[PDB]
Design a binder for these strands. Structure first.
Ligand SMILES: NC(=O)c1ccc[n+]([C@@H]2O[C@H](COP(=O)([O-])OP(=O)(O)OC[C@H]3O[C@@H](n4cnc5c(N)ncnc54)[C@H](O)[C@@H]3O)[C@@H](O)[C@H]2O)c1
Ligand SMILES: [K+]
Ligand SMILES: [Mg+2]
Ligand SMILES: [Mg+2]
Ligand SMILES: [Mg+2]
Ligand SMILES: [Mg+2]
Lengths: 161, 51, 109, 58, 70, 39
RNA sequence: ACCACGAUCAAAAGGGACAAGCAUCAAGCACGCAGCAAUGCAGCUCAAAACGCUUAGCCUAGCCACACCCCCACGGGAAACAGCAGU
């Protein structure tokens, strides 16, 4: 879910006395009257507070994963509307690849933080396929038949025994 | 006997490592104090600008 | 005299855990190229009995030969886990670490 | 030593070390931080290397 | 650069394109027959599979699709 | 190439030698069918 | 040793190792595992070359394979020099 539009900008959230200003100033300094990048910054800060142990450290692998996850969500939201944007499709796919690489590094280095990142961001880590080969019509049909024939043989052997 | 000697060598290296790490900790404390002071100074002025 | 399995002790990385109580482990040895006289890694797959199913994909494990194979391809058992994937304990200092960085300082103890 | 399985690991721990696994199940840990490669070779020769006399007998 | 190789490529391609135009009708029949034989070979491979497996006929509900007919 | 590439490809594989008109034999027997001259 | 204690030698079985060319042979199609069993899981091999085709006796104090053919030889074809000399 997006932060409420009434939320203050990241840059005006700690200035002393921000609660004693007029409603007009509050609107002027909120997410309602800003571009989407400020909303993404607030999302990033929220995720950093929720997940990482030290939210001030932005150079850590977890922080980079959070930032790229927010960027990926932005790209997906863009592409729902812009179906023919090939450049942004490329950017989304490349960002997904980079996040998978960082997740692999995190899993190999810090499993607890890896689990926290996976739960907090709703990411499902998957292992890459072992072989990259075309699944053409002949192979697909043959594999389906082979699975069917194995099932039939299993049924026949169960009947026999 | 050779395994005992190897373990003794490991222990000696561990003591040397503890000494080196203690020195590193001290230097890191000094540098971190300086950087924290600089960070606080920067944040104060940036907050006053946004005020 | 103690076992009929050729490889008595081997170290590998777990590459599969989809079999019940069996870890598929990849072991790499160094083989000399006769022409280039350079050592290259040669890989071999081993099935190791994991009674407690405590092995995860990617961890470095030690396999010990069974006295006799318990199955067609299972000739070993999991002696220990040398490195738990993402949960390495520095053998030299005994402290948790994430890669080259200490998670807990050695001085703390 | 053609029949000894040598395996390398990179940037997994804060410091470098060697570990030998023996047929008896004993494990020998050799810390090598701050040591030159010649020093490491001499140390492993001393602790787990056949002496010259055994080689001459063979 | 050698322009003669580019010229020879031009001549060979132009000569090739003339042949396919001249024998276009013959080629289509040959391709259709080849695809028919291809489909037959694929079916025989599938039949060999279920025959070796033990089944006397195909698995129930299985029908070998035509994966080479346009 | 690099050492990795040379290891992957392995030793060069010289093709089998092509057999000539005598099929790799010193001499052959033959029956004359027709005689003529060529330019 | 012969009475065996065991040595020597060496089968069957189990583990490991091992020719060449073709990837225009790229997928194999049941090739795994756990349980005393019942049964359960859906797995196993493979571009670090599986599966397949073709070629070739080999790593020579020697070794392997074959002994007319049907790999084998109850059985069948049929009547056997790839022992020496010889045709
Ligand atoms: N073929 C694979 O699926 C695969 C899997 C793991 C690693 N690799 C590595 O990729 C390199 C190329 O291998 P090749 O000469 O046998 O492929 P190749 O060019 O000869 O084509 C064979 C198949 O491998 C795929 N392939 C090709 N290049 C690949 C790559 N870099 N990574 C993954 N798949 C690739 C192709 O899609 C094709 O289906 C090798 O170093 C190999 O170790 C390949
Ligand atoms: K025979
Ligand atoms: Mg035998
Ligand atoms: Mg004869
Ligand atoms: Mg015979
Ligand atoms: Mg004779």
């Amino acid at each position: 879910d997006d932060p409420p539009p009434s939320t203050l900008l990241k840059d005006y959230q700690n200035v002393p006395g921000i609660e004693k200003v007029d409603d007009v100033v509050k609107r002027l300094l909120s997410l309602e009257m800003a571009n989407k990048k400020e909303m993404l910054k607030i999302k990033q800060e929220q995720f950093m507070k929720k997940i990482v142990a030290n939210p001030e450290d932005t150079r850590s692998l977890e922080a980079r994963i959070i930032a790229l996850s927010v960027k990926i969500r932005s790209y997906e939201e863009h592409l729902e509307k812009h179906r023919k944007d090939k450049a942004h499709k490329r950017y989304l796919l490349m960002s997904i690849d980079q996040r998978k690489k960082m997740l692999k590094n995190l899993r190999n280095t810090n499993y607890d933080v890896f689990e926290k990142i996976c739960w907090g961001l709703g990411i499902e880590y998957t292992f890459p396929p072992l072989y990259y080969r075309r699944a053409h019509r002949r192979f697909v049909t043959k594999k389906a038949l082979c699975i069917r024939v194995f099932q039939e043989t299993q049924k026949l052997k169960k009947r026999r025994r | 006997e050779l395994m005992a000697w190897n373990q003794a060598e490991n222990r000696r290296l561990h003591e040397l490592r503890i000494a080196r790490l203690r020195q590193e900790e001290r230097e890191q404390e000094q540098r971190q104090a300086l950087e924290q002071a600089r960070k606080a100074e920067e944040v104060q002025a940036w907050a006053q600008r946004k005020e | 005299v103690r076992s009929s399995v050729h490889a008595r002790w081997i170290v590998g990385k777990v590459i599969g855990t989809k079999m019940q109580k069996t870890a598929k482990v990849r072991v790499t040895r160094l083989v000399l190229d006769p022409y280039l006289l350079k050592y290259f890694n040669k890989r071999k797959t081993y099935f190791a009995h994991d009674a407690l199913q405590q092995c995860t994909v990617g961890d470095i494990v030690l396999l010990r030969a069974l006295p006799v194979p318990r199955a067609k391809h299972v000739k070993h058992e999991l002696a220990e886990i040398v490195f738990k994937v993402g949960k390495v304990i520095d053998p030299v200092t005994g402290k948790p670490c994430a890669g080259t960085t200490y998670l807990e300082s050695p001085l703390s103890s | 030593n053609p029949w000894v399985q040598i395996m390398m690991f990179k940037n997994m721990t804060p410091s470098p070390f060697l570990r030998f696994y023996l047929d008896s199940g004993e494990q020998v840990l050799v810390d090598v931080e701050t040591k030159s490669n010649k020093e490491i070779m001499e140390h492993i020769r001393k602790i787990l290397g056949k002496n010259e006399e055994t080689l001459r007998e063979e | 650069k050698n322009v003669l190789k580019i010229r020879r490529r031009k001549m060979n391609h132009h000569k090739y394109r003339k042949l396919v135009k001249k024998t276009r009708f013959l080629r289509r029949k040959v391709q259709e027959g080849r695809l028919r034989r291809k489909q037959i070979k694929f079916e025989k491979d599938l039949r060999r599979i279920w025959l070796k497996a033990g089944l006397k006929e195909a698995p129930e509900g299985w029908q070998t699709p035509k994966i080479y007919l346009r | 190439a690099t050492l990795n590439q040379m290891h992957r490809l392995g030793p060069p594989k010289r093709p089998p030698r092509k057999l000539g008109p005598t099929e790799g034999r010193p001499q052959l027997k033959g029956v004359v069918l027709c005689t003529f001259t060529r330019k």
